[PDB]
Amino acid sequence: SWRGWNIHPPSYPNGKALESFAKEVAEKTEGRVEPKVYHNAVLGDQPDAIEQTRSGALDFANFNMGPMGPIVPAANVLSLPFIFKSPDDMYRIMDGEIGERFADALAEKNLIVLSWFGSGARSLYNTDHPVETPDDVEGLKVRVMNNDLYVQMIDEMGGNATPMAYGEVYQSLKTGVIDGAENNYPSYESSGHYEVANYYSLTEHLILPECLCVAKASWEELSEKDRQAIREAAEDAAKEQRALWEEGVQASKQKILDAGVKINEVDDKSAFQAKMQPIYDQFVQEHPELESLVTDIQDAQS
Numbered sequence: 001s002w003r004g005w006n007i008h009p010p011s012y013p014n015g016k017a018l019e020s021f022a023k024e025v026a027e028k029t030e031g032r033v034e035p036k037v038y039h040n041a042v043l044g045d046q047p048d049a050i051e052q053t054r055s056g057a058l059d060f061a062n063f064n065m066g067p068m069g070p071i072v073p074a075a076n077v078l079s080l081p082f083i084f085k086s087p088d089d090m091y092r093i094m095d096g097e098i099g100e101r102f103a104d105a106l107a108e109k110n111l112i113v114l115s116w117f118g119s120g121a122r123s124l125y126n127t128d129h130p131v132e133t134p135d136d137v138e139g140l141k142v143r144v145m146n147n148d149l150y151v152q153m154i155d156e157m158g159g160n161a162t163p164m165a166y167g168e169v170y171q172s173l174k175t176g177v178i179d180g181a182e183n184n185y186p187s188y189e190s191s192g193h194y195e196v197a198n199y200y201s202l203t204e205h206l207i208l209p210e211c212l213c214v215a216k217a218s219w220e221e222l223s224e225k226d227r228q229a230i231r232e233a234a235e236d237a238a239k240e241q242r243a244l245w246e247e248g249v250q251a252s253k254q255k256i257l258d259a260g261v262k263i264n265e266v267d268d269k270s271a272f273q274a275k276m277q278p279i280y281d282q283f284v285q286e287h288p289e290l291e292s293l294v295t296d297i298q299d300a301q302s
């Protein structure tokens with residue numbers, strides 16, 4: 001018996017892929033390993049679940065790499081704004097040697113990465129006006145996930161930020177406690193945020209991988225043959241997740257458009273990116289040992 005964690009609903013692309021993984025694992029191990037996925041963060045918010053998985057209280061999970069940054073230093077590289085040019089670049093990079101360096105870093109903190117899920121690009125949405133240039137972010141209080149890099153990101157754009165659990169964002173928008181947040185289409189849609197924050201502006205400022213990972217303790221207990229089988233199941237599940245993801249993005253977009261959401265491309269994404277320089281400079285000064293990881297990712301997209 002394995003318990004697994006997903007923050008999203010069962011029908012979200014990630015949810016479907018995880019159920020496929022769970023089935024394939026049970027089938028390939030002849031019932032020796034029987035994973036059960038707990039969706040909707042039933043077993044805790046993301047930071048607490050990461051903790052429970054490191055200690056082996058939870059057996060597997062789909063984590064966004066953003067919240068992984070405060071736990072695994074190398075993972076913070078993935079939260080540098082605009083580090084990836086597109087999700088396709090991110091997939092190519094994460095499926096190759098650079099992705100292995102991230103897996104190595106997570107393993108040191110007791111998480112065994114089996115495959116990488118996509119989460120598109122995250123963009124700003126708010127209740128007040130289209131964002132066309134960085135100066136339009138002035139005056140907006142924007143929710144971010146709990147990584148200091150995201151507060152720095154919003155601050156450099158011109159606004160102000162506040163870290164908050166995903167589950168709380170909807171009501172916080174409804175009550176006016178925050179003016180906006182940022183995410184991909186499927187989250188913006190499935191969470192209901194689009195019902196309150198009607199302006200979605202395509203900053204596409206973060207392209208965050210997500211892992212499908214196992215507690216090191218749970219991993220080590222297995223036979224060698226079952227590890228090989230579960231690794232295969234995870235790879236198949238990620239392939240499925242990425243296919244479901246593309247469809248899901250288009251379906252979510254059409255739904256929010258039909259609902260009257262105002263979507264705008266920004267004037268010039270490079271103007272937002274240029275403002276991020278101090279973030280990169282400070283990062284590589286703090287972490288000289290991670291500088292070559294930053295430059296290797298940048299260089300791999302020329």
Ligand SMILES: O=C(O)[C@H]1O[C@@H](O)[C@H](O)[C@@H](O)[C@@H]1O
Nearest residue numbers: 007064119145166183184187
């Ligand atoms: O903004 C957030 O908290 C959420 O964003 C979504 O894109 C991620 O898939 C989910 O893991 C995060 O919890």
